[PDB]
């Protein structure tokens, strides 16, 4: 549902100690994408959304083969296909990254389906 094997959510892990700032995390997302894509220019072009609160990860337009390259990388916890949270607006959720400019998300606390926790029904 918006999932087409060319939009990928990459969930990461950060130091606690000094808590990374929000800008540090954005930079780290782009750093990670840039190492796989081989260029910072192409990372800035292909990162379209991210969170630093609800989850600590980013979402990018890369193909399936490319997404596999993230699974070994230090700091990467999950590589999962992204999907719409709002079909009408083709909204993938999370804050939007548009060539450096950040658009805060419409539903910031909304948990994406890919990161659902299953709660045992006792």
């Amino acid at each position: 549902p918006g999932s087409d094997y060319n939009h990928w959510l990459i969930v990461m892990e950060f130091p606690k100690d000094p808590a990374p700032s929000r800008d540090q995390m954005i930079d780290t997302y782009l750093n990670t994408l840039a190492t796989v894509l081989g260029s910072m220019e192409e990372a800035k072009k292909n990162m379209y959304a991210f969170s630093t609160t609800t989850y600590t990860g980013f979402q990018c337009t890369i193909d399936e083969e490319t997404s596999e390259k993230f699974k070994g990388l230090p700091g990467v916890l999950w590589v999962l296909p992204d999907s719409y949270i709002d079909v009408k607006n083709k909204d993938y959720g999370g804050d939007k990254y548009i060539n450096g400019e950040i658009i805060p998300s419409t539903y910031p606390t909304y948990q994406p389906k890919q990161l659902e926790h299953h709660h045992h029904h006792h």
Side-chain angles (χ1 to χ4, degrees), residues 1-119:
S3 184
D4 60 8
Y5 291 115
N6 291 272
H7 297 69
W8 296 88
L9 161 66
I10 291 133
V11 181
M12 303 193 60
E13 185 175 62
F14 287 102
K16 324 286 181 186
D17 358 84
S21 77
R22 175 168 162 90
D23 281 331
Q24 275 175 284
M25 287 181 267
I26 297 171
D27 282 338
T28 300
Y29 300 155
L30 290 160
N31 291 345
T32 306
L33 181 55
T35 67
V36 172
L37 294 183
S39 94
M40 177 60 71
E41 211 193 79
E42 238 208 303
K44 277 171 179 178
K45 166 159 177 235
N46 288 108
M47 197 182 77
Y48 58 88
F50 67 91
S51 185
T52 63
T53 58
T54 302
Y55 50 99
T56 46
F58 63 97
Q59 296 137 254
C60 52
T61 49
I62 63 182
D63 61 35
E64 184 170 40
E65 173 178 25
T66 298
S67 71
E68 287 296 310
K69 306 202 207 278
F70 287 93
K71 292 200 168 164
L73 296 172
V76 171
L77 291 178
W78 307 101
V79 183
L80 297 156
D82 200 5
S83 71
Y84 294 145
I85 68 165
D86 174 357
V87 178
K88 91 178 224 70
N89 293 332
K90 293 195 184 68
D91 272 9
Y92 279 99
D95 301 341
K96 301 200 193 81
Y97 180 89
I98 306 175
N99 250 124
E101 208 81 31
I102 310 306
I103 312 297
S105 108
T106 57
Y107 317 87
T109 56
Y110 188 63
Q111 185 84 355
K113 194 167 202 316
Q114 292 83 10
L115 302 175
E116 258 173 15
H117 305 273
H118 301 325
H119 305 270

